[PDB]
């Protein structure tokens, strides 16, 4: 499954 | 941005025998940006009912797609892939050759 942590460049 | 011209291979899913059913493949890769147009041709004419893979890319970031249709090759029939891309001033046509 895709990860559910997100990080802005 | 640096634009990259598509590499193109045209080939059968199985070794070609005259009058035996098969799938005609056109594999386009290494193009940037991702917008691209691929047609399969039978004797210069566009084949309708052509499917394609989901846009993906390899670890080196090169985008790729497989365009493919059912086909039954013969001695007479000419098959080709015709690709349009921002990098191409004219459509690139690559003929299918059973030996490659």
């Amino acid at each position: 499954s895709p990860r559910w942590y997100f990080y802005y460049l | 941005m640096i634009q990259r011209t598509p590499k193109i291979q045209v080939y059968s899913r199985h070794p070609a025998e005259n009058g035996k059913s098969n799938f005609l493949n056109c594999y386009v890769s290494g193009f940037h940006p991702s917008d691209i147009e691929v047609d399969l041709l039978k004797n210069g004419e566009r084949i309708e009912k052509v499917e394609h893979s989901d846009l993906s890319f390899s670890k080196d970031w090169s985008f790729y797609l497989l365009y493919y249709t059912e086909f039954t090759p013969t001695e007479k029939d000419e098959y080709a892939c015709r690709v349009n891309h921002v990098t191409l001033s004219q459509p690139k046509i690559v003929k299918w050759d059973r030996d490659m």
């Binding site: 895709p2 990080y7 | 594999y27 846009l55 890319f57």
Partner: protein, 275 residues
């Protein structure tokens, strides 16, 4: 038995035509098993392999909600990147993202990946040590400083070491033979006369999985690297791959030439001659 799970994200801004397109494809090894497209009529995660269709609506709904939040994140990433590069509002830009985990037969993390490319160039990548970044340029150093400051590497490393590996574990359980089975290549050599003095021997590998393969021509046991034509490995359309290698040989030296096929489907490499 050495498996990997990878997500490939593409976000494409189109300033005239509305908000940016987000697409995702998920892979176990060389097998695509899921897709998501924001331009679908009713955007939802969809199965692309038979062994994943056994997952229930909760699976698809949960993943759909994640892709939606990811798409939004990427929108902000694209906006920041525009500013870093002093780009105009008019231009379309592409963010490609790739993350995943490689495991040994013990099913624990051998290698973790987490990397980005902007407009088709390397931007930033997590180093093999999952503790440090490589930036491609001065723009990517802005991102490096932020992520360094906020210690987001530790977070990533923990995802890659934990959750990534457990999802992979589950998918191998569901896949069984479809994912554990290495299909050896079907091999043959073809002869293509050039003139009365020269012929091309073409050595063929077909119907193989996974994609990783080595094809080489030898002349009396010596490698013909610089004199061998080698096509890029290509999908057949049935979840198998193809490749060939070609060498131009002088008439009556055919039997000096051996084609060598290495593939995990083969206990030991095959040696082929033109017959």
């Amino acid at each position: 038995g050495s498996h990997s799970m990878r997500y490939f994200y593409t976000s494409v801004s189109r300033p005239g035509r509305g908000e940016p397109r987000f697409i995702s494809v998920g892979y176990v090894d060389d097998t695509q098993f899921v897709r998501f497209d924001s331009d679908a009529a009713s955007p939802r995660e969809e199965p692309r392999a038979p062994w994943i269709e056994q997952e229930g609506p909760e699976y698809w709904d949960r993943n759909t909600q994640i892709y939606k939040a990811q798409a939004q994140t990427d929108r902000e990433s694209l906006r920041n990147l525009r500013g870093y590069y002093n780009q105009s509002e008019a231009g379309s830009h592409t963010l490609q993202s790739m993350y995943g985990c490689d495991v040994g037969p013990d099913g624990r993390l051998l290698r973790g990946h987490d990397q980005y490319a902007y407009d088709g160039k390397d931007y930033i990548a997590l180093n093999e040590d999952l503790r440090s970044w490589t930036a491609a340029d001065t723009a990517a150093q802005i991102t490096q400083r932020k992520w360094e400051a906020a210690r987001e590497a530790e977070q990533r490393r923990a995802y890659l070491e934990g959750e990534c590996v457990e999802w992979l574990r589950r998918y191998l359980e569901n896949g069984k033979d479809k994912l554990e089975r290495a299909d050896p290549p079907k091999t043959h050599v073809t002869h293509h006369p050039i003139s009365d003095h020269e012929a091309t021997l073409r050595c063929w590998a077909l119907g193989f999985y996974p994609a990783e393969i080595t094809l080489t021509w030898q002349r009396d046991g010596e490698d013909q690297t610089q004199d061998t034509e080698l096509v890029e490995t290509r999908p057949a359309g049935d979840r198998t791959f193809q490749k060939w290698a070609a060498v131009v040989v002088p008439s009556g030296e055919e039997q000096r030439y051996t084609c060598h096929v290495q593939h995990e489907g083969l206990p030991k490499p095959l040696t082929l001659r033109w017959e």
